[PDB]
């Protein structure tokens, strides 16, 4: 339903994310179905990744990966009070997959740390 939360696309990153304010087989029958499958393929594209980082059911999950300053050497105040999610994404878009892999191993090892912890 309401997956269009773009309402704060021109606002600063910290102002938007941190503190909100029966078919018939014809060309509308197979069109409307592929549009229904194409939507949930992509909802599971991300909810699977959110599960691989220990972030299932979380909009703001903190991680265990320090910030490599080579990704972006910019201050908290010149990110969350100056940039917008649309343009920050573009600036950090190149390293987006390195962080994903690295998030994945931080959660996998965290899964076995609690495994050694609950063994006592």
């Amino acid at each position, epitope marked *: 339903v309401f997956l269009g939360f773009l309402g704060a696309a021109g606002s*600063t990153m*910290g102002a938007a994310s941190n503190t909100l304010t029966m078919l018939q087989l014809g060309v509308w029958g197979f069109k409307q179905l592929q549009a229904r499958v194409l939507a949930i393929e992509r909802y599971l594209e991300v909810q699977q990744l959110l599960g691989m980082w220990g972030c299932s059911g979380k909009l703001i999950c903190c991680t265990n990966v320090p910030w490599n300053s080579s990704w972006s050497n910019k201050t908290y*105040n*010149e990110i969350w009070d*100056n940039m917008t999610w649309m343009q920050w994404d573009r600036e950090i878009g190149n390293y987006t997959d390195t962080i994903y892999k690295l998030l994945e191993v931080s959660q996998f090892q965290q899964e076995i740390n609690e495994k050694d912890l609950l063994a006592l």
Partner: nanobody
Amino acid sequence: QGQLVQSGATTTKPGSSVKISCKTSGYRFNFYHINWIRQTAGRGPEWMGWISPYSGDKNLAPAFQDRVNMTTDTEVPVTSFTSTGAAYMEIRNLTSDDTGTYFCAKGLLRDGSSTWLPYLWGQGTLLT
């Protein structure tokens, strides 16, 4: 980036009222306050006022409260994050004490506690 090119360095005599332009580029003109600051030769650098190119809200010093008219026309979109705006400012009962170079500067950020801070400055305009 961004560059604030100012008006020309034309001179007038007391009793008059001159307008100073400030044509911005390379940044979203609506996202940051425009700020004018005067450097009088016989005084300390005096902050005159910022206006909001988005909200249309102004704030001057009490020494220019009823003496300065600051305005901005709308911005021309160039791309997703580039615009071109123009900033205008006048002085009422003008004398020769107001002699000096006048600067225009855009704000620092668009949020937090240092929102309007004159970060990126212009070229200045010699008066006399």
